[PDB]
């Protein structure tokens, strides 16, 4: 998982 990708639902 890219750390900058969407961390939300």
């Amino acid at each position, epitope marked *: 998982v890219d750390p900058n990708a*969407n961390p939300n639902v």
Partner: antibody
Amino acid sequence: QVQLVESGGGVVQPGRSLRLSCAASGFTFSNSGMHWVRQVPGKGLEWVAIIWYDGSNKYYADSVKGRFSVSRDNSENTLYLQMSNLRAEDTAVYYCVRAYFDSENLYDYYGMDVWGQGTTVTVSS
Amino acid sequence: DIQMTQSPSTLSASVGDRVTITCRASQSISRWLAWFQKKPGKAPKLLIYTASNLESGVPSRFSGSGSGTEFTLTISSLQPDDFATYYCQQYYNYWTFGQGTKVEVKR
């Protein structure tokens, strides 16, 4: 009324541990990724850690990796930062920051939007 | 390993002056750049997201532009509330901030 309130800041001796908390209100804490950002005296703002909305993914900055642990409790709307093996360089104001949240969340790479007022952690013997 | 540089470090200006502060990235970050405002003793507030898009409630006098390595934050008419420090932040590869730019009162 998105509000993030930090707590647990204070004095901690080097090599010891301290846990910070962040109370979240005004939004759905369970639906948002959260960040920890710190500002060491003199030095500029530096990102510490990020945790996913479900707690499944966590990433850390190299300076705190292996000593710092980010956690969350979505049933209590609280974010956590466990700091261990603390050093004087870890003395800073720590901010609880919300990841960017939009209803039309069609973005590829996400940053931060709302910060908390922050809490001070003083590491000294 | 993305460094953010801001010029100038301290900007002297007056009320009503058009103010422009520049932010440079060590590599191309496309438009994944954000501008924050921090007044002393207060928490940073996000003004501009995706390099140019203004955030909700942010006054229309604030403006941002750029794509790649060079970015700017422009205040067309400087107001008293606008005297503070501004940070740029990239969110492509982790999150790094610029050293900050203080807008002081010219005298």
